């Protein structure tokens, strides 16, 4: 699902907040902003 009038829309956005965290520990960025090696 992809919607963004959807209700799914806040959850999916939501249980995401917890799951960025894996990727923050690999780099700890989230936007387009993320650096390189």
Partial sequence: ???KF???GT???KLTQYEIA???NKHGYYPWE???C
């Fill in 22 to 24: 894996w990727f923050k």
């Fill in 6 to 8: 959807n209700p799914t």
């Fill in 34 to 36: 993320i650096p390189r």
């Fill in 11 to 13: 959850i999916v956005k």
């Fill in 1 to 3: 699902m992809k919607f």
